[PDB]
Amino acid sequence: ASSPANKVYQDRFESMYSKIKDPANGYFSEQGIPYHSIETLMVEAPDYGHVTTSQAMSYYMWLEAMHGRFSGDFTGFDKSWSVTEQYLIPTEKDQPNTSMSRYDANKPATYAPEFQDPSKYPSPLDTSQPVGRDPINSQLTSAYGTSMLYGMHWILDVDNWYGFGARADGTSKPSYINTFQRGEQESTWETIPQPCWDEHKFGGQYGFLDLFTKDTGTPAKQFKYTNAPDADARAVQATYWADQWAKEQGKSVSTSVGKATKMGDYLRYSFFDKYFRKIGQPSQAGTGYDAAHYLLSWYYAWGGGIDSTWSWIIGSSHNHFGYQNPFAAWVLSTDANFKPKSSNGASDWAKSLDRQLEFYQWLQSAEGAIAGGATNSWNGRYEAVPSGTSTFYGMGYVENPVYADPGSNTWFGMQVWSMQRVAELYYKTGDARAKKLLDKWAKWINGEIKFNADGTFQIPSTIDWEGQPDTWNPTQGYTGNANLHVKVVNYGTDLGCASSLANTLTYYAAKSGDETSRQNAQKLLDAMWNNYSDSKGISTVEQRGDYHRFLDQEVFVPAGWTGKMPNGDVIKSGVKFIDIRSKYKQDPEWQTMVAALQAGQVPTQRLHRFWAQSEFAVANGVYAILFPD
């Protein structure tokens, strides 16, 4: 039987769940897939509001798990897994096993350099550069009896707004797409959206392929997908709680547990350097697990031929603290119901749990905020790490891993998303390493929450960094990183971040007994409920400071390359963001946005992001369970 919950906060969960699931609110497509946001005029990581992301799907899982806990009905949670498998994990038709079975674990992919400006792409493939061996592929094909990968592709054009359709048909929905391809300076404003399945039917002469990669011959027809490890790890996290909550009530989500466990087994590909080079010795090809950093890196990716049979897989050399999930790693390595089938699945996750906790502590600043991360591939070309750069297992510190436009660690949101998982681990296990991190981090952030007399509040929004951590010595441990400092640049009322913050502080308070954390969590939740509720969930008006880029951002197109988007928009040198997305001019908010820009005003919007609404709902449910009085 489930323990009693605080009825006030349970009712607030239940209300939010109804608003989110309400067909009249429009959070979901007709196929039952959640959109990034209700509103369509939306550019921030996805560049259209009615895409879906693996991030949104994993929040949909967490939301439904919590509904199961309060309602006793887990059919919604099982359905969230069904929708995921149907639409976001590429099927047999989307990643033909005929190509995947031709994968060569001794030569997983061909090296190409990354560049610091999009104008340097296409990047030339070089077969002479060393590439290491993949030691896990044989474990996976042996356990699961296929060469297909079981992981979510990160983004889906749910209603076929771009027009690529499914497997180049132009008409089916949903449509697998990707955007980012051209390194750290390619913002969301500078991409050329492209189909995952490229049969050269759209775009240029060879579809979109030769915008990004240059090979010897004629570009082949080919598919490719990219994982977002932080989403797949959150799926495992959510499913663990669904299982716990289901078993407290004599119910079962065993089917979904098997899917989560399998996903966690494939998620190990994010543990490896991009081209399986040795960690801390990047000039050398790895021999297997010497190429594993055991962190959740920015991606893994795979692809292969459509009309001939070959395939490739890469991990990623770049690691951000924001992606780590020690809770998921604890689950997969210790809980017998979530032990992966592969021979080394559980022990690899055990190593990852230890490595991840070291990583957070290495990056913890003097004040307590967590700095960016590290890379095994300096400048994305395995260049020499400058003398004086601090290192973690031979990987050089990077202040803003992977993206510089804007810096990937200049947003406060990464702090809460990631420390929330450390707080669950600490709540569940009392782990000393987690305690130490949280004591200092929570003390930092409790000093940065500002409550106003009118019931409104502010928390950090944009942050900046000085210095670097001390070189990590696993036997010395944490030095205090006296020369690493966070700066709060501005404050805001980001409701998704405030919700995640409330969640983190609630788990931490429950375990540590810290009253200041508990009351800050409740005050945030109350302020949001009382002051920001609307008929669709919660919202506030926000400034969209980068929206001038709709009209003024030039998109790079190589000299002489011309093509067309499916709607006929011409792609050629000179185009702006809006020129290759001309359907955006039909958006109900377009004229409002343009009028603002014409007057030299910053446009504002009131946005209902699926992840933020779910975050708020889950944060209420968490407080209700942990603080029943």
Ligand SMILES: OC[C@H]1O[C@@H](O[C@H]2[C@H](O)[C@@H](O)[C@H](S[C@H]3[C@H](O)[C@@H](O)[C@H](O[C@H]4[C@H](O)[C@@H](O)[C@H](S[C@H]5[C@H](O)[C@@H](O)[C@H](O[C@H]6[C@H](O)[C@@H](O)[C@H](S[C@H]7[C@H](O)[C@@H](O)[C@H](O[C@H]8[C@H](O)[C@@H](O)[C@H](S[C@H]9[C@H](O)[C@@H](O)[C@H](O)O[C@@H]9CO)O[C@@H]8CO)O[C@@H]7CO)O[C@@H]6CO)O[C@@H]5CO)O[C@@H]4CO)O[C@@H]3CO)O[C@@H]2CO)[C@H](O)[C@@H](O)[C@@H]1S
């Ligand atoms: O012999 C036969 C045959 O051979 C052929 O040759 C072959 C050869 O054999 C073969 O080896 C090679 S393989 C080659 C391949 O060809 C080539 O294509 C491939 O290239 C790869 C590149 O090397 C690699 O660099 C790139 S990596 C890139 C990925 O592609 C891309 O998908 C990924 O995108 C990421 C994305 O960056 C990330 O964001 C997301 S997930 C999630 C985040 O986790 C989360 O933070 C974020 O949250 C958002 C939130 O949603 C928002 O609401 C908030 S908004 C917030 C504001 O930010 C605040 O400022 C504001 O104040 O408040 C607001 C409100 O809160 O913001 C947060 C934070 O941002 O959201 C997102 C989700 O929404 O994940 C994705 C996925 O990970 O990026 C990666 C890094 O850039 O990949 C390329 C592949 O795609 O390389 C291989 C090997 O080299 O191929 C040969 C040629 O074919 C011959 O050719 C033949 O002839 C013959 S027949």
Ligand SMILES: [Ca+2]
């Ligand atoms: Ca740029």
